[PDB]
Amino acid sequence: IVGGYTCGANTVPYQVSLNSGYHFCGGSLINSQWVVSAAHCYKSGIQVRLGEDNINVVEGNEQFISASKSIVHPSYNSNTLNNDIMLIKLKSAASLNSRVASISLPTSCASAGTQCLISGWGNTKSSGTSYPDVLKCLKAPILSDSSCKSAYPGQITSNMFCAGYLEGGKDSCQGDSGGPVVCSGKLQGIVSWGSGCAQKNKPGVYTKVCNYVSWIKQTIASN
């Protein structure tokens, strides 16, 4: 997250860190047994880390649980990142409490102009690299689909939306991948892609979760 703020420990209790020896992606807890992340975060050997603030220090509220199954969306296209969503089932159910809590799925999409909360442990610099160890947060509005398509001609589908600031300075970034965009209490986005970070006229692109709620619910119920 570039241009954000330190969230505060466990103030985003649905935020998970996916660990394969190191943090490599965010995700969102949607019930005691299931995490949603980006399909471009897919790999084997995932451990889900809940209740994290400093990902390098055991602070006392963590739960570390291995994934039993990963399900990349059937229509994911790695060339374009269309349908960039994946479900991860935990080997054992998380113990839900005030620092480890699910986020509600949308019953409808969000509109342009809605303010959202984006969070993660990704890069905090727009030029260069600096990775924080505590969770960073950013308030950012959903941008119009027309401004999104003008920023990235040819590349935006109905399964994507832009959020952030066309002036630059405030954005998600590498390492935030797979993490949440929450608006009015609902998980509306997943950190997906973009050109650089916090550059002018290059906002972040996010998987449009509301298009996937039926698939999420039916997949969880059948697995």
Ligand X SMILES: NCc1ccc(CNC(=O)[C@@H]2CCCN2C(=O)[C@H](N)Cc2ccccc2)cc1
Annotated binding residues = 52, 54, 57, 62, 171-172, 174-175, 177
In the three-class reduction of DSSP (H, G, I as helix; E, B as strand; rest coil), residue 64 is classed as strand
Residue 176 sits in the site that holds ligand X (CB under 6 A): yes
Specify the DSSP class assigned to residue 128. Answer: S
Nearer to Ca ion, 98 or 111 (CB): 98
| Contact with ligand X (CB under 6 A) among 52, 53, 62, 171 | 171
Residue 202, CA distances (Å) to 1, 66, 158, 206 in order: 14, 35, 18, 13
In the three-class reduction of DSSP (H, G, I as helix; E, B as strand; rest coil), residue 159 is classed as coil
Alpha-carbon gap, residue 157 to 208, rounded angstroms: 10
Alpha-carbon gap, residue 66 to 174, rounded angstroms: 23
- 145: annotated active-site residue: no
- 177: annotated active-site residue: yes
Burial class (CB in 10 A: 0-12, 13-18, 19+), 9: middle
| Contact with ligand X (CB under 6 A) among 18, 50, 71, 81 | 81
Residue 110 sits in the site that holds ligand X (CB under 6 A): no
| Contact with ligand X (CB under 6 A) among 32, 54, 80, 114 | 80
Of the listed 28, 37, 40, 102, which one is catalytic?
40
CB of residue 206 to ligand X, shortest distance in Å: 9
Alpha-carbon gap, residue 94 to 49, rounded angstroms: 10
Of 49-57, 65-73, 174-182, 214-222: span binding ligand X (CB under 6 A): 174-182
- 53: annotated active-site residue: no
Q: Which residues are catalytic?
A: 40, 84, 177
